[PDB]
C-alpha cells in the first residue's frame, strides 16, 4: 500500500509498506496522529494517511531541527505521547480566550496558555508559531503537546507556571529585551547590572512591579543593607514572581496573574485577567469581581520602555 511518512506534517515522503509486516519492522517508532502504531500491522483503512516517524536519517534530522529547533532524540516520541492525551481535552472559549477544561492536572498549562494569549510574544520554532496560531483559533491540542514536550513534562504531571514560562521564553525571540538594575550601598557605592533576554523579563521575589521600580532591600556583602532598584526596562511585558502569598489585584494595574491554592506538594492554579473588571478563569469556569485578593504567585505587566528618574 501507499502511505506517507513525515517528521513535520508539512514535507511528506511517500513510502510503500508491506501490509504483512508491522510498521515497527519498516520504519522504527511510528505514530498516527499521536497513536503508537509500532506494534500494529498496516490496515486497509491506513491507505493515504500521514504517519510520524522518528528522525532516522539526515534529511529527517534537518527537517526536524528546522521545524522544532531541538535535536533531543526523544523529543518527537514525547510530543506524540503528549498529543495522544491532549487531543482528547476540551478547549472552551472563556472570556474570549482559549482555555482548557480540567483534566490530567492541566491547570498550570491552562494558566500558561491564557497568559500567553495576553502578552506580545513571537515564537522562533515554526512548530510553536503554527500550533499557537491554531490554539488561538481554538484548536490547542498540538500547542499544549508541544509545551509539554519542550518542558520535558509528561501528561498528568504536576506543573509550575513559572518554570513553563521560563522554558517557553527560552524558545521565543526576546533577545532585544534589556534590563538595567542599580544596587546602592551607602558604604560601597553604586553597581549597575545589564540583563538580556529571559533574565530581562523575569524576576523572582516580589509581585509588585511598582516596588521593583521604587526599590527592594537586599543584603550587601559588606554587611549593611543595600537598595536594588530598576533603572531601565525595554520589553513588551514583565513577569514578577514570588512564593504564593495573599495579594490584592487592582483593576487596571496589571495584565494578568496566576493564583496558586495549595502547598508545595499539592495545589491548583487559576488565572486572573484585568479587563473591564477582574475575571477569574478556572479551566472552563469564569467569574468576575471588581477587586481581587488571593494567593498570587505570578503577575504579568505591560511594558514598552521605562527609564528611572
Amino acid at each position: 500500500i501507499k502511505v506517507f511518512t513525515t517528521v513535520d506534517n508539512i514535507n511528506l515522503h511517500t513510502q510503500v509498506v508491506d501490509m504483512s509486516m508491522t510498521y515497527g519492522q519498516q520504519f522504527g517508532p511510528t505514530y498516527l496522529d499521536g497513536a503508537d502504531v509500532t506494534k500494529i500491522k498496516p490496515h486497509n483503512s491506513h491507505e493515504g494517511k500521514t504517519f510520524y516517524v522518528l528522525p532516522n536519517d539526515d534529511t529527517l534530522r534537518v527537517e526536524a531541527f528546522e521545524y522544532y529547533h531541538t535535536t533531543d532524540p526523544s523529543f518527537l516520541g514525547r510530543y506524540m505521547s503528549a498529543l495522544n492525551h491532549t487531543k482528547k481535552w476540551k478547549y472552551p472559549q472563556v472570556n474570549g480566550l482559549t482555555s482548557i477544561k480540567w483534566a490530567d492536572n492541566n491547570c498550570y498549562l491552562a494558566t500558561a496558555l491564557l497568559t500567553l494569549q495576553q502578552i506580545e510574544l513571537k515564537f522562533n520554532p515554526p512548530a510553536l508559531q503554527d500550533a499557537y496560531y491554531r490554539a488561538r483559533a481554538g484548536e490547542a491540542a498540538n500547542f499544549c503537546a508541544l509545551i509539554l514536550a519542550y518542558c520535558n513534562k509528561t501528561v498528568g504531571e504536576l506543573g509550575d507556571v513559572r518554570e513553563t514560562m521560563s522554558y517557553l521564553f527560552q524558545h521565543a525571540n526576546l533577545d532585544s529585551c534589556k534590563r538595567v538594575l542599580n544596587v546602592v550601598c551607602k558604604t560601597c557605592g553604586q553597581q549597575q547590572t545589564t540583563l538580556k533576554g529571559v533574565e530581562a523579563v523575569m524576576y523572582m521575589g516580589t509581585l509588585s512591579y511598582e516596588q521593583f521600580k521604587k526599590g527592594v532591600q537586599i543584603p550587601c556583602t559588606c554587611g549593611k543593607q543595600a537598595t536594588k532598584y530598576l533603572v531601565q526596562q525595554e520589553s513588551p511585558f514583565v513577569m514578577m514572581s514570588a512564593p504564593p502569598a495573599q495579594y490584592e489585584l487592582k483593576h487596571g494595574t496589571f495584565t494578568c496573574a496566576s493564583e496558586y491554592t495549595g502547598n508545595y506538594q499539592c495545589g491548583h492554579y487559576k488565572h486572573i485577567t484585568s479587563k473591564e473588571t477582574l475575571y477569574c478563569i478556572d479551566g472552563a469556569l469564569l467569574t468576575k469581581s471588581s477587586e481581587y485578593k488571593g494567593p498570587i504567585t505570578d503577575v504579568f505587566y505591560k511594558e514598552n520602555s521605562y527609564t528611572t528618574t
Binding site: 509550575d160 538594575l181 540583563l195 523572582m204 556583602t221 495549595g262 495545589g267
Partner: protein, 75 residues
Amino acid sequence: MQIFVKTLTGKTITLEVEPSDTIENVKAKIQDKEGIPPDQQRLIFAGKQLEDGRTLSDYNIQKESTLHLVLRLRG
C-alpha cells in the same frame, strides 16, 4: 569561600563553596545540610533564577553573597 542561603522560613544556612562549583553541587550541599531534594530546589540571586549547568563564577557570586532558596510549585 562561604555563601549564605535564605530559606522560605527565613532560616539562613551557611555553605562552603568554590566559584567553580556548579549550581547542581550547591543544591547537593543544600540537600546534605537540610534534606530538601535537589529536584524541588530553585536558587535565586538578586531576583534572578540560577540554572544548574552554570557555575557560581558565571553568575558573579563573590564571597559572603546571599542566595534565596525557593521551591518548585506542583500545580
